Amino acid sequence: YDDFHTIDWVREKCKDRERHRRINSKKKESAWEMTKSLYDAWSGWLVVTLTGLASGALAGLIDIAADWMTDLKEGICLSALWYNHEQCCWGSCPQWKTWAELIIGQSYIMNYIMYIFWALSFAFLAVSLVKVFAPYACGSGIPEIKTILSGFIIRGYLGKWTLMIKTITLVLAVASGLSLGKEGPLVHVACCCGNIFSYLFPKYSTNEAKKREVLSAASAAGVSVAFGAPIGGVLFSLEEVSYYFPLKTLWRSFFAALVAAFVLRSINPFGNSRLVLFYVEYHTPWYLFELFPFILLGVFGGLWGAFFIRANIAWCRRRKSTKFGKYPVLEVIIVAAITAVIAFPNPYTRLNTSELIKELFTDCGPLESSSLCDYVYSAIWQLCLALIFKIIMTVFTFGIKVPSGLFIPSMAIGAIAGRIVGIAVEQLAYYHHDWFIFKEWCEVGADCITPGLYAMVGAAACLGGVTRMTVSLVVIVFELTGGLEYTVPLMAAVMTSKWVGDAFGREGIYEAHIRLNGYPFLDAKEEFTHTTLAADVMRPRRSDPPLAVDIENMINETSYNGFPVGFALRRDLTIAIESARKKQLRSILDMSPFTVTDHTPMEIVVDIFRKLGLRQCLVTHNGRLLGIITKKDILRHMA
Amino acid sequence: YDDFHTIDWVREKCKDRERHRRINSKKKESAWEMTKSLYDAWSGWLVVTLTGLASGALAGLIDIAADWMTDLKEGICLSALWYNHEQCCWGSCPQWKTWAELIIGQSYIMNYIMYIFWALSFAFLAVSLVKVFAPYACGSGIPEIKTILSGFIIRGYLGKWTLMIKTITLVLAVASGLSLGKEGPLVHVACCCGNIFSYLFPKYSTNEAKKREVLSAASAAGVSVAFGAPIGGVLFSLEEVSYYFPLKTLWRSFFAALVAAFVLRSINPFGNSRLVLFYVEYHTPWYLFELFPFILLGVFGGLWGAFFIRANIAWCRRRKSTKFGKYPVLEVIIVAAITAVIAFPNPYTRLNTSELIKELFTDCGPLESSSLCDYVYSAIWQLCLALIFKIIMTVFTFGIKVPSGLFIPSMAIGAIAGRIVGIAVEQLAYYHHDWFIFKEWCEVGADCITPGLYAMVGAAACLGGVTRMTVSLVVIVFELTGGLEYTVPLMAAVMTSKWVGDAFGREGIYEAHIRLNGYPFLDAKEEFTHTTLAADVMRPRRSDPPLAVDIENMINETSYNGFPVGFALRRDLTIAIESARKKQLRSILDMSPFTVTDHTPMEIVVDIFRKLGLRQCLVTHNGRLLGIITKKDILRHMA
C-alpha cells in the first residue's frame, strides 16, 4: 500500500491466513518451530507492552519538559530544571528568581513585558518547528486516527521523526500558554507507538490489518497515560476510535492503557502522587436527591456545543478561504500576542488551564483558603469575564497549525459551569440551610455536596456535547477518578449533555474535523434515510460515458485503484511489469471478486462496505455484469 | 417464525426499517406522533428497567424460598418462615426446633433418618414438578440461550408458565441439597424476562431482532442479580453469550444488570447486607510477589477442566444411550438417596455449597474461631475426603433432568484448591516466617496474605477451565467483589487457567452442552482449518440427485425452509394460499437474494454467514446459478 490509499480488508485477512498456514505447516519439522510460533504469539502482546512503556515514559517526558519550559515564562529555579516550580521551590527563595529579580532585582511593567515577550518567543519557536519539520502534528490528531482506522493509508503519518516532532511541539505549544491541550493527542502518539514498536516484528510490519488491530489497541494508551485513566481509555478505543473492533481486541486493547497506567504508577521516585495537575481522586458516596443538577448542568454543556462546533468550525472555513491562511505563523504570533496582552491582567486567566482544572476539582479543606474557598462577588464577576474570554479564545484556538487539543480547555469550561451551581447552592444554603432540599437528607456537621465532583461532571457534559461520547466518557471519568459506585452520575450527565447537544445537529468536533478536512470517512453513527433504488449508487453517471472495464491512459482519466477483467490492481501491474522487464498475468489476476444484485437496496450494500470494508464490488443482474461500485462512489452519493 | 426455526437477520432488519420509515412518515401529522415516537424509543430502556426489576425481585424470591425450604431438612422456625435460620434464630431456642425435638423431644439416628427422608422427598417433588410441568428448565440453560442468540427459534422457551416453573424448580432443586446452582440460570430467567416484559409492546413482540437485542442485554441481568456483579454480567453478555453484539448494545445491556444490582441494593429492610451467602467484599491492596500462586493454582483449574469436561460429558452420553434414561426420576431419587447417604457423616460436605464458598472466602478475624481459623491435620484430611466426594458427585450432577447449575460447585472446588495454598503458606510461615519469600516484603504485625482472595481466584480459574471465560470472568470477579485495583490478578488467573485447560481440547461445558445436545451452533471461537474449494461446502452431494429448485411433496422429501425461483418461504406460501382460498404470487416473491461467486473460498463465505447469519444463499459462476448454500449444509460439512 502506497501513501493516501485504502486497505482491502479481505486481502489483509487472506495474507494473514496464508502466513498462519505456512507457519503451522513449518511447525511439523521440529519443536523449535512450535516454540517460535509461541514466541510470535507472545510478541503480539509484547507489542502492546512496549507501546505502554513508551506511552508512560513519553507522557512523563512531555510533562517534565512542559513543566520545565512553561514556568520559564515566570522564572527558573537554578538548582533544578526538569522538575516543576513547586518541586524546586519547596524541597528545603534564593534558588528561585523570577525574571524581574533577574533583570532589575526588585516592577509590574517589567513582569508584564516579560511574560509577553517570552510567551511570544515560545509560540514562535513552536510554530517554526512545526512548519519546518512536521505539518501532521497540527490538531489533536484524533479524527485523523479515526480515518486511519476507517481503512486509510498514510505511510509517513507514524514515522519516528513525526512522532518526535509532535512530542516536542506539543510540549512547546502547551508551554506557550495558548488554550491548547495534550490529553488526546497521546492517542495519535499511542497509535504511532503501536506502529514503531511493531516495526521490529514482521507480523505487524507486513500485514496492515494487524497494524490496524494494534492501533485500535493503543488508541486507549493516550487516554490512559494522559490522565491515568485506563478503562476509560480502552472503552474510548472500543466506542469512539476503532471503526472495526472485534471483542477479542478489547481485552488486548485494555492492557495497553493499563500498562501505561502501570508505567505511570511505577514512575514516582520523588514522592509525588499526582498523575496530572488536576488529579483529584474521589471516594465520596452519593445519594438520590443529587440528580437534579446532574441533568440541569447538561443544558450549558449542550449549549456550549452549539456555541463551539459552530463558531470554531465556521472560523476554520474562513481560516481556509481567506488570505489569512497564507501567513499562519504570523497569525499564531498575533494570536499568541493577544493571548499574552489580555490574559495577564486577570490572575484566573493568566494561570494555566490544567491547573485551573486542579483548582476547580480540589474540594475545600480546613487548611486551604484559596479563591474558591474564600467565603467575593467581584471575584465571581472576574471569573465570568475570564470564562467568556476563554470561550472566545479556545473557539479561536483548536483549528491552528500547531499541535492543539481541546480536552483541557473544554473540561475547564465545563468545570466552571459545574462549580457555578455548587457556589450558588452553598451561598443559598448559608442563609437558608433549612430550605427543603437541605432539610430532608443532609446531616448536621458533615459535608453533604461536593462542588468539585459537579465540576468534573460538567466537564464531562461539555465534552459530550462537543464530541458526543456516550459509552466511553462514562468510563473516562470512571478512571480519571476511581469509581464503580459513581458510574450512575456519569451515565445521566452524559445522557443529558448528549440530548441537549443533539438539538442542533449530528456532528461533533471530531466528526466536524473529519468533515471540514473531508477525510474519506464513512460515518458509523448515522443511517441512510433517502429511499431509492441501487440504480443511482453505481457509476458512471448519466453525464459520463460507459464504464471502461492502454492501462496508463485509463488510470490518467480516472483514479480508480482497481479495474475488472478476475481483477487486478495498479500496484500489482506495476510490480509485475517491472519484474518481467528486469527478467525479459494470470498468476496475479484475482478470480474471486465480490458481487451484489443490482436490485439490492442501499441499506444492505452500504453496511456491507461499512463493517466488512471491502474496497470495491461488481454489480450484476441475472448474472450479467453491469458496473463497479467503490467506496468513493458511495461517499460521493452521500455528499 | 415457528418452533425449531432459524432467523433471517436481513428480513428482521428490513422489517425494522420499514417500521421506522412508517412511524416517521406518520410523524409529520401532529406533535402527538412525535411524542409517541419518543415513547417508543424509550420503550427499550423501559423494557430493560422492568427486566432488572423482575431480575432483582425474583432473585430475592428465589433466595427467600430457598432459605425457607432448604433449612426444612433440619427444622423450621414457627414464628417466621420466609427468612433464614439465622434471621429467626438471632433476632431476639423455643422459636426453633430441630425436628428431633419435634418427634422425640431430645438422637443421632433420628436426625440421620429424617434428613434422608426429607432429602428424598424434596428430590421427588422437584423431579415430579419439572416432568409434569416443564422439561426445558433442565440444566443451567446458558448454552440454549447461546443457541437462541445464534439464530434459533423456540416459541415456548420464554413463556410465563415455563418461567415460573423454572423459578420454582430451581428453588426446589437447590433446596434438595444436590450439587447444583442457580447463578447462571438467572441468565435464562433474565432472557425470558426480556421477552415477557417485552410482550406488552408491539415494537419488541413484532420484530425478532429486537428480541435478540434485549436477550443479549438481559443475559447480564442474571450474572448481576445472582452474585451482585453488574459489569461482570454485561461483559459476560458481550463476550460469552451474545453471538452478535453491536457496541451500542453494551451500554444499554449494562443498565439491565445494573438495575438488578439497583433492585438488589434497595431491597434490604431487615438490615442484612449480604448479596448472597458468600458475598465477601474485598478492599485489601496487593503487591508484586503474590503473583507466583496466581499462576500455579491455574494448573488444577486447567486440570479440573480435563477432569470435568470429560467425566461429565462422558456420563451424559451414557445417560442418553442406556436404559437408565428411561427412568430419570428414579435415577434422581437414587442420586438424591446417595446424595444424603454419604454427605451426612462429614459436617463439611453435609453443609450447603454456597455457604461453603462463604466459609472459604471469609477471611479470619480476631473473633471468629471456625474450622478454617482453627489453628487440625485430621480436619484437613476430612476436607480432602469431602473434596473428592464433591468431585465424584458434581461430575455426576450437571446433566440431570432438574434445573442444574455448576457455578457454585465449580467455584467451591476452585476455592478449596486456592485455600489449600493459603493454608500451606500460612503453616510454613508460622515456623519459618523469616523465609526469603516472607523476609523481603511483609511487615511485622499486619496481615500480608489473604487466603480468601486466593480461593476466589482459584474458583475463577476452575470456571475458566470449565467454561473458558477470559474477557468477562475478570469482570465477574471484578464486580462480585469491588475491584479496579484487583483486575490484574484476575487476568493472570484466567490466562493460566485457560492455558492449562486448553491442553486437552477446545470445548467447554457450555460448548460441550451445545455439542452433546448438538444445537445448531456455529462455533465463534474457532476458525476453519481444512483447505478445500467451494464445491465441497455446496449441496446436493455426489450421492444425491440434482437440486430441486407439488410443493408439499417437495417439502416432504427435503426439509429446507425456502427455495429459489426471486425466492419464497414456506410460511409465506402457507399464509398466501390460505388467504387466497378464504378469498375465492409475485407480491410475496422476494426478488433480492444474496449471491456469492462459486470460486469464493470457505473462509469468506463461512464468516459472512457467521456474523450476518443469512439463512441461505445462491451460488453463481459467471452469472450462472449452480446451487443453494444454507446454514444446515455448512454445519453438516463442519460435522
From Swiss-Prot, chains A, B:
Tissue expression notes: Detected in kidney, in the apical part of proximal tubule cells (at protein level). Expressed at high levels in the kidney while a low level expression is seen in the brain. Within the brain, it is prominent in the hippocampus, cerebral cortex and olfactory bulb.
Glycosylation sites: N352
Pfam entry (one): CBS
UniProt KW Repeat keyword: yes
Post-translational modification: N-glycosylated.
Stated family: Belongs to the chloride channel (TC 2.A.49) family. ClC-3/CLCN3 subfamily.
UniProt: ATP binding residues: Y560, N561, G562, T630, K631, K632, D633
Cytoplasmic side: 505-639
Annotated keywords: Antiport, ATP-binding, CBS domain, Cell membrane, Chloride, Cytoplasmic vesicle, Endosome, Glycoprotein, Ion transport, Lysosome, Membrane, Nucleotide-binding, Repeat, Transmembrane, Transmembrane helix, Transport
Functional description taken from the UniProt entry: May influence large dense-core vesicle exocytosis in adrenal chromaffin cells.
Entry protein name: H(+)/Cl(-) exchange transporter 3
Keyword flag Glycoprotein: yes
Recorded GO CC terms: axon terminus; early endosome; early endosome membrane; endosome; endosome membrane; external side of plasma membrane; GABA-ergic synapse; glutamatergic synapse
InterPro entries: CBS_dom, CBS_dom_sf, Cl-channel_core, ClC, ClC3
GO biological process: adult locomotory behavior; negative regulation of cell volume; neuron cellular homeostasis; phagocytosis, engulfment; photoreceptor cell maintenance; positive regulation of reactive oxygen species biosynthetic process; synaptic transmission, GABAergic; synaptic transmission, glutamatergic
Residues of the CBS domain: 538-583, 589-639
Protein location: Cytoplasmic vesicle, Secretory vesicle membrane
Site (Mediates proton transfer from the outer aqueous phase to the interior of the protein): E183
Membrane topology note: Multi-pass membrane protein
Membrane-crossing segments per the record: 42-79, 110-133, 159-177, 183-202, 250-268, 292-317, 324-344, 380-400, 405-424, 486-504
UniProt-annotated binding residues for chloride: S140, F407, Y510
SUPFAM superfamilies (UniProt xref): CBS-domain pair, Clc chloride channel
Residues spanned by motif Selectivity filter part_2: 181-185
Major subcellular site: membrane
